[PDB]
Amino acid sequence: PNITNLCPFGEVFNATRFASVYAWNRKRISNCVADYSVLYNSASFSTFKCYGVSPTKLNDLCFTNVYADSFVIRGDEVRQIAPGQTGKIADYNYKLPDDFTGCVIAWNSNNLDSKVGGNYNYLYRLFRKSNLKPFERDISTEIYQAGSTPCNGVEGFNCYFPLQSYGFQPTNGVGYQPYRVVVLSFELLHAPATVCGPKKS
Amino acid sequence: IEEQAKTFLDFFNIQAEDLFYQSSLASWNYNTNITEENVQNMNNAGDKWSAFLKEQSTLAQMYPLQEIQNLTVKLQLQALQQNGSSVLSEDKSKRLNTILNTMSTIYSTGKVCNPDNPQECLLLEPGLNEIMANSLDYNERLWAWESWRSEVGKQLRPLYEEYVVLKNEMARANHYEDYGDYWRGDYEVNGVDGYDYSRGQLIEDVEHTFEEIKPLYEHLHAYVRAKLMNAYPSYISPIGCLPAHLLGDMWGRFWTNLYSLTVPFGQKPNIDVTDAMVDQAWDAQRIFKEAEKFFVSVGLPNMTQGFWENSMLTDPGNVQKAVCHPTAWDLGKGDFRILMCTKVTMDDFLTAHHEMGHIQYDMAYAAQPFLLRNGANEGFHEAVGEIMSLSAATPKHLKSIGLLSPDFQEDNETEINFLLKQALTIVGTLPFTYMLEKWRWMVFKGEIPKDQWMKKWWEMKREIVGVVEPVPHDETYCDPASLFHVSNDYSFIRYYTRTLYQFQFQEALCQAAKHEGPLHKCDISNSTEAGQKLFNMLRLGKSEPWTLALENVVGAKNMNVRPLLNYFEPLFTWLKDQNKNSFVGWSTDWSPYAD
Ligand SMILES: *[C@@H]1O[C@H](CO)[C@@H](O)[C@H](O)[C@H]1NC(C)=O
Ligand SMILES: *[C@@H]1O[C@H](CO)[C@@H](O)[C@H](O)[C@H]1NC(C)=O
Ligand SMILES: *[C@@H]1O[C@H](CO)[C@@H](O)[C@H](O)[C@H]1NC(C)=O
Ligand SMILES: *[C@@H]1O[C@H](CO)[C@@H](O)[C@H](O)[C@H]1NC(C)=O
Ligand SMILES: *[C@@H]1O[C@H](CO)[C@@H](O)[C@H](O)[C@H]1NC(C)=O
Numbered sequence: 001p002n003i004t005n006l007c008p009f010g011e012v013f014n015a016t017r018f019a020s021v022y023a024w025n026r027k028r029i030s031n032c033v034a035d036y037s038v039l040y041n042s043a044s045f046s047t048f049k050c051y052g053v054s055p056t057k058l059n060d061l062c063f064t065n066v067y068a069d070s071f072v073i074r075g076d077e078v079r080q081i082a083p084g085q086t087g088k089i090a091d092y093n094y095k096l097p098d099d100f101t102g103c104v105i106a107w108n109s110n111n112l113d114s115k116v117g118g119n120y121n122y123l124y125r126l127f128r129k130s131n132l133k134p135f136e137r138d139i140s141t142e143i144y145q146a147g148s149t150p151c152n153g154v155e156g157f158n159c160y161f162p163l164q165s166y167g168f169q170p171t172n173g174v175g176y177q178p179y180r181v182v183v184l185s186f187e188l189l190h191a192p193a194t195v196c197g198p199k200k201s
Numbered sequence: 202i203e204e205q206a207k208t209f210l211d212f213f214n215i216q217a218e219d220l221f222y223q224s225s226l227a228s229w230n231y232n233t234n235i236t237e238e239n240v241q242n243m244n245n246a247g248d249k250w251s252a253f254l255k256e257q258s259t260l261a262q263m264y265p266l267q268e269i270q271n272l273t274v275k276l277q278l279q280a281l282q283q284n285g286s287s288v289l290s291e292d293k294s295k296r297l298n299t300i301l302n303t304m305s306t307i308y309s310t311g312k313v314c315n316p317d318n319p320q321e322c323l324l325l326e327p328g329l330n331e332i333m334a335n336s337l338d339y340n341e342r343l344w345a346w347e348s349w350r351s352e353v354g355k356q357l358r359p360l361y362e363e364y365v366v367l368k369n370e371m372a373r374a375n376h377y378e379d380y381g382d383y384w385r386g387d388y389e390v391n392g393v394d395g396y397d398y399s400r401g402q403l404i405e406d407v408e409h410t411f412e413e414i415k416p417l418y419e420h421l422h423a424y425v426r427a428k429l430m431n432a433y434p435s436y437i438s439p440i441g442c443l444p445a446h447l448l449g450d451m452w453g454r455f456w457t458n459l460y461s462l463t464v465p466f467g468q469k470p471n472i473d474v475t476d477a478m479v480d481q482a483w484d485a486q487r488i489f490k491e492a493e494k495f496f497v498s499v500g501l502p503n504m505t506q507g508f509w510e511n512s513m514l515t516d517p518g519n520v521q522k523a524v525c526h527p528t529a530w531d532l533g534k535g536d537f538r539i540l541m542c543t544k545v546t547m548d549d550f551l552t553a554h555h556e557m558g559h560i561q562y563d564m565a566y567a568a569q570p571f572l573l574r575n576g577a578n579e580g581f582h583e584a585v586g587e588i589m590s591l592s593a594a595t596p597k598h599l600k601s602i603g604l605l606s607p608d609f610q611e612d613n614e615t616e617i618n619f620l621l622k623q624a625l626t627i628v629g630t631l632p633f634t635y636m637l638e639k640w641r642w643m644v645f646k647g648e649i650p651k652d653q654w655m656k657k658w659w660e661m662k663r664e665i666v667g668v669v670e671p672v673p674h675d676e677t678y679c680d681p682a683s684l685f686h687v688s689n690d691y692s693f694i695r696y697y698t699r700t701l702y703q704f705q706f707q708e709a710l711c712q713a714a715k716h717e718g719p720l721h722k723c724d725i726s727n728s729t730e731a732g733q734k735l736f737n738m739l740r741l742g743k744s745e746p747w748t749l750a751l752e753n754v755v756g757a758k759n760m761n762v763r764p765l766l767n768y769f770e771p772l773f774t775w776l777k778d779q780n781k782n783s784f785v786g787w788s789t790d791w792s793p794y795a796d
């Protein structure tokens with residue numbers, strides 16, 4: 001029982017920079033034996049919820065396609081990263097399917113992402129003409145027309161730039177603090193390639 | 202259409218949260234360390250915040266209020282659509298701001314000079330207030346009192362007149378009959394199926410409720426007069442108005458400083474536990490933690506980490522000037538804090554409960570949309586803070602938390618001393634608030650001609666309050682402007698309405714708590730039913746009519762005095778026998794300068 005490639009989860013979770021939620025990252029995971037128990041028992045997450053296979057039961061399965069979606073959101077938006085949810089993020093920045101097979105993991109990054117004077121680097125979409133499909137990413141930035149008068153790509157009465165920044169500051173209360181979110185999406189497809197849990201003696 | 206306004210308010214709330222936070226944080230920084238740098242930063246943040254509000258109130262006019270059916274949009278938008286003083290021409294606007302700053306300046310440079318040694322000047326804060334609170338020399342008290350109306354009062358008179366005119370033009374431009382009518386809009390409710398309230402009803406309710414409490418006041422007056430005559434013999438008439446300068450302060454607003462002369466049973470000890478705090482080595486943290494427990498015990502949330510980590514709970518670390526005057530803060534973005542340079546004393550114990558009560562109200566409505574994040578009306582915020590303090594003060598509480606000895610014997614005489622102190626603090630101020638607002642409203646409405654302003658003031662102080670000012674001042678004076686709120690543009694009626702809301706709340710919650718005795722012996726800290734009952738209202742902010750907020754907490758759609766009377770009924774019962782051998786009420790023909 002030797003140790004093989006375990007997949008670069010370190011680059012998923014303890015990555016330096018995270019994406020804006022409106023333009024979330026999509027990272028492919030493959031060709032390895034991945035231990036998920038070690039994320040669960042790290043006790044380093046505020047949120048660790050599965051809609052699919054339990055956090056330590058993932059270790060008894062093989063998947064062919066594992067994807068890690070990642071981004072930064074406000075703490076009060078953490079509850080929206082789930083199947084069946086609606087809201088500013090769930091409706092048009094990032095949406096999980098009602099039949100999602102994976103797990104959503106999140107943690108407080110106030111000491112990493114908040115800045116004195118305000119961290120305005122992270123963006124979310126405030127407006128979209130329609131809601132996103134599950135796992136859809138839309139990073140187009142035309143000026144959003146709210147009114148009936150045709151808007152010629154110019155901010156004005158009833159016409160708004162669709163993306164707005166956050167303003168993360170060290171003394172924001174909980175819920176206005178930034179959170180780093182990783183979503184692990186699991187698929188079983190048909191290819192000579194897997195992501196497996198560990199062998200037991 | 203509502204749809205476009207909805208989109209707009211969502212966009213507005215996303216901007217407003219950040220700019221308000223920057224401004225609030227800049228003001229906070231100033232208040233914890235007074236220095237020019239922080240002044241410059243709060244002033245700059247304040248100006249871009251006002252500029253933002255003006256740009257948004259301009260955009261807001263393109264969303265006709267009448268097309269919006271939902272209240273959360275209609276109310277937030279109506280709040281944003283007010284044009285304020287922008288309705289005034291550029292010259293009238295800058296002139297009014299100049300006047301307001303000038304009036305604040307005259308009051309603020311609050312000094313008078315003593316003819317005994319003209320180069321020696323007194324300030325209002327130390328000095329004149331110290332004389333009015335502690336000296337028993339009729340003549341010293343009289344000079345100090347007059348010197349404030351002369352000097353500061355007289356200097357303000359010509360500004361006050363221009364002020365009234367400019368404010369009425371502004372109010373009319375915004376479709377109010379006058380500025381008093383503008384202020385009364387804070388209690389106005391419309392289009393809510395019976396929870397509606399017309400601005401003119403504030404006057405009817407204030408006048409009605411006032412008449413109903415006069416008997417408590419008349420007996421308090423007679424009792425106090427009987428006692429002050431032994432401090433100021435010859436000077437006070439047995440059947441008259443008390444001279445204004447003999448009431449304990451510069452305006453005759455509180456009768457609290459007279460307590461030491463009027464103490465019912467001077468042979469009995471008080472419940473001032475400060476010595477216990479000293480023997481038990483309590484510090485500021487203990488004081489705030491006991492206050493936190495009060496709130497936790499009733500079912501309210503605990504304080505946030507930001508509160509415990511960032512608050513100025515003690516004197517500043519270096520020899521710094523800071524605004525130590527106690528106050529709660531809400532910066533936006535869930536950042537809650539307090540400023541209070543706490544000393545180990547019962548007064549700060551009670552203050553900590555008062556301000557934390559304000560924080561709990563701010564936390565409860567934190568989830569409301571930004572323009573609705575305030576109390577139901579101007580008197581609600583303080584009414585909540587006052588009930589938390591009132592409960593913390595009872596001997597029942599104090600002995601239960603190990604602060605007052607468990608062997609303390611509370612009896613009839615103790616209860617009376619307690620209630621009189623409270624009456625001097627509460628009952629004795631209602632006619633002041635009532636009289637002042639009634640007078641200012643008549644001034645703003647144009648009912649009192651500019652050359653009859655002091656004439657009416659003096660007559661009303663004798664007929665309503667029962668106090669006679671010792672000097673027959675001319676119309677060159679503006680004695681009401683000698684008070685902070687009058688010269689600095691504040692409404693005052695909030696104190697009248699707050700007091701009555703306070704007692705209605707205390708009664709409703711003591712009933713929820715199943716208290717079995719009189720209201721002054723009530724402690725609701727162990728009642729989670731009372732906690733939830735109040736909470737359900739606190740969480741609403743301004744999203745609902747204040748009249749509904751009262752139905753939810755007290756079972757009423759309006760204010761009442763019966764709970765005030767019930768709180769003090771046993772004091773009253775006692776006063777009724779104390780005055781059986783004397784005149785109750787007062788004559789207004791007598792004055793201390795009559796001859
Ligand atoms: C977390 O950070 C630590 C730092 O040593 C690193 O070793 C680890 O691989 C990172 N990632 C995870 C998923 O623990
Ligand atoms: C004084 O206010 C300034 C604002 O820059 C702050 O940086 C400084 O630490 C404060 N001084 C003290 C002694 O708190
Ligand atoms: C106000 O907004 C709320 C949002 O849930 C909506 O339910 C309510 O119906 C709106 N008011 C009216 C009168 O439509
Ligand atoms: C303020 O709003 C009112 C609402 O009708 C409008 O009539 C008035 O002209 C506006 N004033 C300014 C200064 O924009
Ligand atoms: C607040 O947190 C403290 C931490 O121990 C807890 O003991 C207390 O009961 C909490 N209060 C509430 C209302 O949850």
Ligand SMILES: *[C@@H]1O[C@H](CO)[C@@H](O)[C@H](O)[C@H]1NC(C)=O
Binds near residue numbers: 617
């Ligand atoms: C003391 O208690 C007795 C009980 O009968 C009561 O009659 C008496 O009036 C009380 N004393 C005072 C000052 O109220």
Ligand SMILES: *[C@@H]1O[C@H](CO)[C@@H](O)[C@H](O)[C@H]1NC(C)=O
Binds near residue numbers: 498499601727728729
């Ligand atoms: C009421 O006081 C008792 C006295 O110890 C205390 O134990 C109890 O916890 C208090 N009630 C609540 C809800 O904390």
